[PDB]
Design a protein around this ligand. Structure first.
Ligand SMILES: [Cl-]
Lengths: 243, 250, 244, 195, 231, 241, 111, 240, 235
């Protein structure tokens, strides 16, 4: 054996064990989700409060790309930042050459090819993050989830991290109960509930909720953070459902 | 990132063997049989078309390839490796000869260039040797007809007749009995077909056999008229029908 | 990373030897024997082809003996492909010198540079060395007739008579026995063939398994001629000395 | 710089080179030696662009001396001249070419013959019985065409050279402050102190 | 074990051992403390010597007039990273006439450390940093780890026995956060914090190192007789 | 045994990394099929969407390489998309350099050459994919050319790829033994698609809904994929006969 | 053809006493026959009790001052907050200016 | 470019590649340097398993770096050519810029620096060569003898030996060489050098090379008969 | 094998730690700093009696106001000294002043970690850098291949370092004269050296504000050795 010691080496199965090992780092990370709605997308993430000494609201994890795309990720946080930095370069060069802001599917493949490239050589390490991202473009709303292998698909709802299975189950109920569609403001509330429900899988340290959204009607197609009254309203909705 | 493999992957073992070359030759041994016979007025090269599937169109896969109008090549071993070697061989005939001298290289020198390319895959950083042996038949004004074998090491030898691949040991013995220095081209084609039937198992017809000659100039295959000195390619690929005609009087 | 797969071709053993150079010399010891003998009026080069097949084209063939310029030739022992890389470099180097100084390159200078290239592959670059040993036979107006040898280490030495390739130990003893300083070319031709005939791994030495060459001043007045022997000429010289 | 002459006689090559170094309206020096010994039996004189001349001469000197040490052997005058020509032939298509003209006087010990080579900054080489660079040639060539014989002695060559310097001192516009004369023969290079 | 030869290799549980070994170098380092109020931010650092004949290794480095850090671990790596911060702070001033936000400073260090954890040949940085600063959004304290992770805090501590000070600050949180417009009291709280990490040794005059930055105070470092006030 | 980790020869003249890349091909557990009509070339592939949270419209292994060339992939999606992006770029460059649309077989050879390089060069791994290229070439007519991780490629009368490829292959062989011709003797592409689905049903022994399949069609001057309702219309026609 | 230089006018003056030194300069800034500004300072406090002015082409003048101010900053970082003496500043400015010998700063500098 | 760090530290603080290069030197033929009151003599062993040699054209063991400095060595012959070439180039470069030939110390310092560079450069192995560098500084009559080794360290020696069995000949020199009174003449210096080699060599025939360097670029190599006379004289005094 | 820039599980760089072992094998070097000057002394340690000891150069001038002593793989120090000299002269060119001793030391230490897969391995030599400047006066620095440097009142490096350092701990005080420091270096060198200390196998040097960096003659050191022996016998 020894097939798992080097990246880009096929095992006798046809598997790249180094990528599968990177997936373990992702599973170890905190929970993050994405919900697709009527005219946009909503992102939410679990922030573990390690200590009282952490300044509330001041360790922001959700990241914006361009002005219309939001990105959240679970796993090695620095690896996620590297991927977003590349995403921002890719989005900038697209807008530079083609004028129009990068479409979400186009953006998705830019990240996909870049992450896939880090499975081709033994001189680089695969990304230790699964990234949930999306936004609004000319063709409407799109939600994506990208994995260490470079694999990505479009999603109605997406979840990753330590509480992914709990979150996935809760997401599937929303898809079944709302075939016509979910509204943006509803999706924000639901996102809060799901993070609180997914927190049962990480319940030693209490946590801080962080939400963002892109909507054609509510945010005018731009990425914004949910703060203040709308955030507290979403927290209260979530608190009422766990009890 | 970047190619960090700047070191040799083929090295000498304590016994003096170059492992990767030996293993490349082993891959050639597994390969389908191909042969070449030199006549007084021509050269013939032949091989079996091993089809991967009956749904596959074996006409689209050419094992015998034109390198120059007077030089052709066939192989035994790994097909993909051969395909890229033909691409590189065709190009080097132009870049390192035709663009300099305004004429095509003689067989021995084109062979020498292909051999160089295969030698470098034996010494350069981060590469394995080519897993093929080539048989290159050709003609040029000052050397006449010639036939060469090129191995994975980059070594090449001139042959009156020979065979490489699967059943090369038996095929070489067969050729030793039949070859003389007075063979006419048609006699060499006949012997080529006889030799190949021994190594082929399944169907033996013009659709499963690939055969080309280096013989007389073909003005009809030139594509134009008006220049007396340009008389056409000496390389010609025998058609499926032309092979079957010779298999009746076999 | 790629460190895992590096053979480290340019390192020392605990005993202070270069692994790859030693193993390259082991490879060369299985190649066909090549002999060089220097006489007062010329030089002989004789080499044994590696186990021949009857269907090999013998006349239009070159395996052992190569011409570097009009005054210098080499006998090869090892990988032919490797040798041709070095031969083309040597051929170019000779022409560079002639272009620069308008004089044919002195034999040692050509030998030193080719040997320096071999040395480089043993000290840096992480590549395998050239699995080749040369016998250089040449003439210049400083030292006259000269024989040299170089090997994968890039070390070269001068000789009156020398062998490379297979059975050098037995060949060298035989040359050391019958060689003397006042020897002529025709005597050296006979010594070269007699030595190969006794050291050969074949049953009997024939014309088709040999390459032969002389470098004489046997042209017309004060000039040197290179004679690469044809098949029929080797057949005749083999009869003339009574080997066949 | 300015005046450099060369004469090949029976057994030696004689080079004469002007001593003046002038910049603007001032003769800065009147004892300048416009020559470098490349090897024991090879001497090179030079003239041309300021700075370039000495830089080139010394660069060639270093290369020939390097060759001598490496091979423990002296290059022939013909071999040295060809090396110098090629360096100038390279130079002429460089970003900034060497604007240097040279004469190479040598004694070939293998042939036992003196040899004189004239090479200009373009890399134009010729072997000659007598040579000159710059405006000097416009007087000396015709003079030497008349008085030169191929079988002359070194002493006859020096008298022939005195005749050239006298003509230049009479008809040339500039004061070149006399010449340093050097002889190249079988015994090597030596300087005539009283000229 | 078999997966700690280089930074480019993941372990079967998804760990990067070379990064974890770099983290271990910080734990061996001498303790340093960081804390802030709404008006000022303070660094306190315990310096370490080779022996009684040697000097005490300097722990605090100035990056700009409004920013600086303290170090724990490989000091040469702190010199490389602080130099990078000096350049980035400087680029922001020359090009945009803008004081570099302490938050951006953290983002830049994160991304620089990260690149050294994903490529062959390189190694992770072997040092942890506490960055303090005062910018357009008030006082700030950051904690840098060579894994790439940067975290904004009210107070913290890194190095050997840093858990003692970190616990103390966690208790004192409500008190020291409201020490506004009073530098000497905020330092006193920091000096009392680092005292919870001392064993057999006490704070002397050539042992203690204090730094402060705030509303009307440039980043300045105190050593020698200037810290005698706080013992 | 480091000869199994990189693409160098083993003692028996084999490249294990290439062989293991072939096994990655079936990791998706999807079967594909390609056939030729008179005027068209049809390619079909299974579509399996296990997760309910997935957007089914974004799940695809068929790619539009150029206006005339389509490509279906058997293998993991990251490597598939890598191959697709490169093919698109190569086809675009070919058109710019040489002034005419890149033929299906020429693109196949080019991608096969690239694959060959990964089998010879150490620092690059092979892609764990098999690429089936389809078109209606302006010179050669309906065309199917297939590439693998070894760098091998060849034209096909028809072909199949996947875990249950052999069952589909023999099913097609037996049809062409019977018909005595190199293609599907049919006028419209609609019925060639129906043939393709019918014979896949027979070979695999499964029934298909509209969301279980994925269809690509190449005609003269365009290659296009079918929607769910286009396939449903096609499924209804088979059922009513 | 584009001309990378301009002339922004103005004049400067420096005098030294026993225990003091003055550096004066007018505040007018011009191009051709137009006034750009009646108050645009070009004498600057560069720290360490060094005042500087680079008069001529204002873009080059501002660039040089900017680079020297930065040089003082890095002198502190690299040499333990040591005060940059006026003689050391002078030598440092020579290298700033000569560094663009073949594309010069079009200014007359006084510190 | 090939980058591998081949020369690296081991747990005990040794650089094995440098130490293994010293083993290559230990394998090489013996070389000895002895400096007298007005000269330096370089003696070299030549192994006699090689008969049928051509001594006219075979590379000599002692090489002239300039007309006033010589270099002998022990170890890999091919490696030594690279050092000799670089030294010869630097010698001419020094004359060109300083307008003065190299001092023996300077030339030694350069050669040693080259050797050192190959001990901490990526992709290269150390030189398997130790050198003895001898000569006279320009316009100086004080004899100079220096030694270098693969690590890059160099030093001056009254007398020194390197190569195989060098520890035996060093032992001889340590008791036979008086610092207070070095060999007063050329004859005395050559004899002591030949004596020291005769402790190790075998036959005093075509096995010993001797090169004498005197002040002002006065270097000459002794012939067989000249050396053989020293061998004959020493043996007759020995039988006592 | 393994990467050159690899961390151990204890958070240390393997190669740096291994180079420290090479330095322990080196010859002893001692430095003492006073208000009258800084003294630098080294053990020469000739491998053979035929070796001319005065050619052993382990104390070295960097500038007039800065000197340097070495211990370990001394060949590695050549490029460090070359860099130090260039750094010192370059700073004088750029700023028309003497460069601070600490700034010089920092510049030399920047080279240290510039190795990996830059040079192939760390330096196998430690340096004692002694000098004077107007700001911080007389200074002594210990520069390691880790890239770290400590200022010292007194410091010993090499094979006899830990024994000599313990001796320096007792003997050093803030009022030592230059003469007292000279004798103290000789005394401690004689204690840790293998062979008997004399003027030929040991070397002294100092740096003073007035006269700058000076290597002592063998005649001058010999008298200090004689003065030292007489004083130890006198009680
Ligand atoms: Cl291609």
């Amino acid at each position: 054996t020894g097939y798992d010691l080097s990246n880009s080496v096929f095992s006798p199965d046809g598997r790249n064990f180094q990528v599968e090992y990177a997936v373990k780092a992702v599973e170890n990370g905190t929970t993050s989700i994405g919900i697709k709605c009527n005219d946009g997308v909503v992102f939410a993430v679990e922030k573990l409060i390690t200590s009282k000494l952490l300044v509330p609201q001041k360790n922001v994890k959700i990241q914006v790309v361009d002005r219309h795309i939001g990105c959240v990720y679970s796993g090695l946080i620095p690896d996620g930042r590297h991927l977003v930095n590349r995403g921002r370069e890719e989005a900038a060069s697209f807008k530079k050459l083609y004028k129009t802001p990068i479409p979400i599917p186009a953006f998705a493949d830019r990240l996909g090819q870049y992450v896939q490239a880090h499975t081709l050589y033994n001189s680089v390490r695969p990304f230790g993050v699964s990234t949930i991202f999306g936004g609004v473009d000319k063709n409407g709303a799109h939600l994506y989830m990208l994995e260490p292998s470079g694999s990505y698909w479009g999603y109605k709802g997406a979840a990753t991290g330590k509480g992914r299975q709990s979150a996935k189950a809760e997401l599937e109920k929303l898809v079944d109960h709302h075939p016509e569609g979910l509204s943006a403001r509803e999706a924000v509330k639901q996102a809060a509930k799901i993070i609180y429900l997914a927190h049962e899988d990480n319940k030693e340290k209490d946590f801080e909720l962080e939400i963002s959204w892109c909507s054609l009607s509510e945010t005018n197609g731009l990425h914004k953070f949910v703060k203040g009254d709308l955030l507290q309203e979403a927290i209260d909705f979530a608190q009422k459902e766990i009890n | 990132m970047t190619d960090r493999y700047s070191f040799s992957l083929t090295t000498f073992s304590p016994s003096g063997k170059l492992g990767q070359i030996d293993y490349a030759l082993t891959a050639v041994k597994q390969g389908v049989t191909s042969l070449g016979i030199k006549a007084t007025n021509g050269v013939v090269i032949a091989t079996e078309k091993k089809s991967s599937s009956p749904l596959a169109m074996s006409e689209t896969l050419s094992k015998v390839s034109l390198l120059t109008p007077d030089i052709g090549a066939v192989y035994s071993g790994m097909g993909p490796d051969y395909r890229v070697l033909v691409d590189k061989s065709r190009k080097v005939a132009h870049t390192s000869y035709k663009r300099i001298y305004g004429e095509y290289p003689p067989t021995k020198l084109l062979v020498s260039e292909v051999a160089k390319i295969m030698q470098e895959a034996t010494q350069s950083g981060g590469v394995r040797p080519f897993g093929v042996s080539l048989l290159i038949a050709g003609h040029d004004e000052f050397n006449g007809f010639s036939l060469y074998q090129v191995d994975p090491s980059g070594s090449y030898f001139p042959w009156k007749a020979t065979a490489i691949g699967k059943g090369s040991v038996a095929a070489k013995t067969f050729l030793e009995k039949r070859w003389n220095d007075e063979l006419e081209l048609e006699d060499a084609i006949h012997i080529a077909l006889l030799t190949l039937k021994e190594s082929v198992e399944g169907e033996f017809n013009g659709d499963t056999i690939e055969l080309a000659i280096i013989g007389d100039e073909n003005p009809d295959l030139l594509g134009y008229t008006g220049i007396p000195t340009d008389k056409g390619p000496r390389f010609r690929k025998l058609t499926s029908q032309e092979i079957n005609d010779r298999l009746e009087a076999l | 990373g790629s460190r895992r797969y590096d053979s480290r071709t340019t390192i020392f053993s605990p005993e202070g030897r270069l692994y790859q150079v030693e193993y390259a010399l082991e490879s060369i010891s299985h190649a066909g024997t090549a002999i060089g003998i220097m006489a007062s009026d010329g030089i002989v080069l004789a080499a044994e082809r590696k186990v021949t097949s009857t269907l090999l084209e013998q006349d239009t063939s070159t395996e052992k003996l190569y011409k570097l310029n009009d005054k210098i030739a080499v006998a090869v022992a090892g990988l032919t492909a490797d040798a041709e890389i070095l031969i083309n470099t040597a051929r170019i180097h000779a022409q560079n010198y002639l272009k620069t100084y308008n004089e044919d390159i002195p034999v040692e200078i050509l030998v030193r540079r080719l040997s320096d290239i071999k040395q480089g592959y043993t000290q840096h670059g992480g590549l395998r060395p050239f699995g080749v040993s040369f016998i250089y036979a040449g003439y210049d107006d400083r030292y006259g007739y000269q024989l040299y040898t170089s090997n994968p280490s890039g070390n070269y030495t001068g000789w009156k008579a020398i062998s490379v390739g297979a059975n050098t130990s037995a060949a060298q003893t035989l040359l050391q026995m019958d060689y003397k300083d006042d020897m002529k070319v025709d005597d050296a031709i006979e010594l070269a063939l007699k030595t190969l005939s006794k050291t050969t791994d074949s049953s009997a030495l024939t014309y088709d398994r040999l390459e032969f060459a002389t470098i004489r001043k046997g042209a017309n007045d004060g000039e040197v001629y290179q004679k690469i022997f044809k098949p029929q000429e080797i057949k005749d010289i083999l009869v003339k000395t009574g080997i066949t | 710089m300015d005046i450099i002459l060369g004469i090949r006689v029976q057994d030696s090559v004689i080079l004469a080179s002007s001593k003046a170094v002038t910049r603007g309206i001032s003769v800065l020096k009147d004892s300048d030696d416009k020559t470098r010994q490349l090897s024991p039996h090879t001497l090179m004189s030079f003239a041309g662009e300021a700075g370039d001349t000495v830089q080139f001469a010394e660069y060639i000197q270093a290369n020939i001396q390097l060759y001598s040490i490496r091979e423990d052997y002296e290059l022939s005058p013909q071999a040295v001249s060809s090396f110098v020509r090629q360096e100038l032939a390279k130079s002429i298509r460089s970003r900034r070419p060497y604007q240097v003209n040279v004469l190479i006087g040598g004694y070939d010990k293998k042939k036992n013959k003196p040899e004189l080579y004239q090479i200009d900054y373009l890399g134009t080489k010729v072997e000659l019985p007598y040579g000159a660079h710059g405006y000097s040639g416009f007087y000396t060539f015709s003079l030497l065409d008349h008085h030169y014989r191929p079988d002359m002695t070194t002493e006859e060559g020096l008298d022939l050279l005195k005749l050239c310097v006298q003509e230049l001192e009479k008809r040339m516009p500039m004061d070149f402050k006399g010449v340093i004369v050097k002889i190249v023969d079988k015994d090597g290079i030596r300087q005539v102190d009283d000229f | 074990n078999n997966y700690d030869g280089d930074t480019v290799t993941f372990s079967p549980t998804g760990r990067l051992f070379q990064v974890e070994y770099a983290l271990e170098a910080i734990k061996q380092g001498s303790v340093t403390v960081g804390l802030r109020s709404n008006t000022h931010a303070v660094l306190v650092a315990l310096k370490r010597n080779a022996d009684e004949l040697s000097s005490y290794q300097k722990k605090i480095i100035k990056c700009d007039e409004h920013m600086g850090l303290s170090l724990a671990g490989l000091a040469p790596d702190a010199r490389v990273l602080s130099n990078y911060l000096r350049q980035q702070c400087n680029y922001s001033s020359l090009v945009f006439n803008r004081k570099l936000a302490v938050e951006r400073a953290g983002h830049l260090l994160c991304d620089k450390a990260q690149k050294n954890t994903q490529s062959y040949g390189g190694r992770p940085y072997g040092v942890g940093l506490l960055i303090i600063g005062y910018d357009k959004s008030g006082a700030h304290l950051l904690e840098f780890q060579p894994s790439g992770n940067v975290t904004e805090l009210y107070g913290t501590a890194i190095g050997a026995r840093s858990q003692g000070a970190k616990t103390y600050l966690e208790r004192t949180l409500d008190t020291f956060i409201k020490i506004d417009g009073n530098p000497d009291e905020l330092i006193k709280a920091g000096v009392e914090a680092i005292s919870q990490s001392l064993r057999d040794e006490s704070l002397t005059v050539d042992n203690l190192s204090i730094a402060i930055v705030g509303k009307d105070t440039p980043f300045t470092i105190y050593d020698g007789e200037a810290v005698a006030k706080y013992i | 045994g480091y000869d199994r980790h990189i693409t160098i020869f083993s003692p028996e003249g084999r490249l294990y990394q290439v062989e293991y890349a072939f096994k990655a091909t079936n990791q998706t557990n999807i079967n594909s099929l390609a056939v030729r009509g008179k005027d068209c070339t049809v390619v079909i592939s299974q579509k399996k969407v296990p997760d309910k949270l997935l957007d089914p419209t974004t799940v695809s292994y068929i790619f539009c390489i150029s206006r005339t060339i389509g490509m279906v992939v058997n293998g993991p999606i990251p490597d598939a998309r890598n191959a697709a992006l490169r093919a698109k770029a190569e086809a675009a460059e070919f058109r710019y350099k040489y002034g005419y649309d890149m033929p299906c077989d020429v693109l196949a050879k080019r991608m096969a050459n690239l694959s060959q390089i990964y089998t010879q060069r150490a620092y690059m791994r092979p892609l764990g994919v098999i690429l089936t290229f389809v078109s209606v070439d302006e010179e050669l007519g309906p065309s199917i050319y297939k590439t693998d991780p070894a760098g091998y490629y060849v034209g096909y009368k028809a072909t199949a790829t996947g875990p249950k490829q052999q069952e589909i292959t023999t099913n097609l062989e037996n049809h062409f033994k019977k018909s005595k011709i190199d293609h599907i003797n049919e006028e419209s592409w609609e019925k060639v698609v129906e043939f393709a689905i019918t014979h896949m049903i027979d070979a695999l022994g499964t029934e298909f809904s509209k969301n279980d399949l994925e269809v690509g069609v190449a005609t003269k001057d365009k290659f296009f994929t079918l929607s769910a309702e286009n396939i449903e219309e096609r499924l209804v026609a088979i059922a009513e006969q | 053809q584009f001309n990378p230089y301009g002339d922004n006018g103005g004049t400067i003056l420096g005098i030294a006493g026993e225990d003091f030194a003055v550096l004066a300069g007018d505040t007018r800034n011009i191009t051709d026959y137009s006034i750009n500004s009646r108050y645009e300072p070009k004498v600057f406090d560069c720290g360490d009790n060094i005042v500087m002015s680079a008069n001529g082409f204002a873009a080059d003048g501002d660039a040089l001052v900017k680079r020297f101010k930065n040089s003082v900053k890095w002198y502190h970082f690299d040499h333990n907050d040591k005060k940059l003496s006026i003689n050391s500043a002078a030598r440092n400015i020579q290298h700033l200016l000569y560094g663009k010998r073949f594309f010069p700063y079009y200014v007359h500098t006084i510190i | 470019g090939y980058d591998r760090a081949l020369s690296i530290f081991s747990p005990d603080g040794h650089i094995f590649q440098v130490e293994y290069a010293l083993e290559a030197v230990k394998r090489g033929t013996c070389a000895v340097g002895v400096k007298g009151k007005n000269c330096v003599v370089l003696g070299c062993e030549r192994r006699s398993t090689l008969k049928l040699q051509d001594t006219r054209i075979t590379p000599s063991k002692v090489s002239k770096i300039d007309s006033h400095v010589v270099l002998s060595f022990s170890g890999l012959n091919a490696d030594s050519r690279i050092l000799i070439e670089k030294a010869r180039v630097e010698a001419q470069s020094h004359r060109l810029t300083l307008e003065d030939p190299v001092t023996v110390e300077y030339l030694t310092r350069y050669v040693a620096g080259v050797q050192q560079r190959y001990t901490q450069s990526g992709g290269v192995r150390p030189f398997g060569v130790s050198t003895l560098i001898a000569g006279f500084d320009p316009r100086d009559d004080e004899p100079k003898l220096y030694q270098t080794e693969p690590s890059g360290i160099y030093s001056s020696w009254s007398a020194q030996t390197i190569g195989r069995n060098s520890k035996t000949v060093r032992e001889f020199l340590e008791k036979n060489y008086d610092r207070k009174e070095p060999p007063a003449t050329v004859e005395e210096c050559v004899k002591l050098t030949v004596r020291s080699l005769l402790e190790v060599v075998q036959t005093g025939a075509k096995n010993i090379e001797i090169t004498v360097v005197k002040p002002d670029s006065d270097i000459v190599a002794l012939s067989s008969e000249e050396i053989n006379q020293y061998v004959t004289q020493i043996e007759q005094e020995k039988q006592e | 094998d393994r990467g050159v820039s690899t961390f151990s599980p204890e958070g240390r760089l393997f190669q740096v730690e291994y180079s420290l072992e090479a330095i322990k094998l080196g010859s002893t070097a001692i430095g003492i700093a006073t208000k009258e000057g800084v003294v630098l002394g080294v053990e020469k340690r000739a491998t053979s009696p035929l070796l001319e000891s005065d050619s052993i150069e382990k104390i070295v001038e960097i500038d007039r106001h800065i000197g340097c002593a070495m211990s370990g793989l001394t060949a590695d120090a050549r490029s460090m000294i070359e860099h130090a000299r260039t750094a010192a002269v370059t700073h004088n060119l750029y700023y028309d002043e003497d460069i601070n001793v600490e700034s010089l030391t920092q510049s030399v230490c920047d080279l240290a970690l510039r190795f990996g897969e830059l040079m192939s391995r760390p330096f196998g030599v430690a340096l004692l850098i002694a000098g004077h400047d107007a700001d911080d006066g007389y200074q002594l620095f210990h520069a390691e291949p880790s890239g770290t440097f400590y200022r010292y009142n007194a410091k010993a490096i090499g094979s006899g370092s830990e024994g000599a350092q313990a001796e320096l701990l007792n003997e050093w005080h803030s009022s030592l004269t230059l003469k007292e420091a000279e004798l103290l270096v000789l005394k401690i060198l004689k204690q840790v050296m293998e062979e008997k200390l004399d003027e030929n196998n040991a070397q002294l040097s100092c740096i003073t504000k007035q006269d700058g960096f000076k290597i002592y003659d063998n005649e001058k050191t010999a008298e200090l050795i004689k003065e030292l022996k007489e004083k130890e016998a006198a009680e």
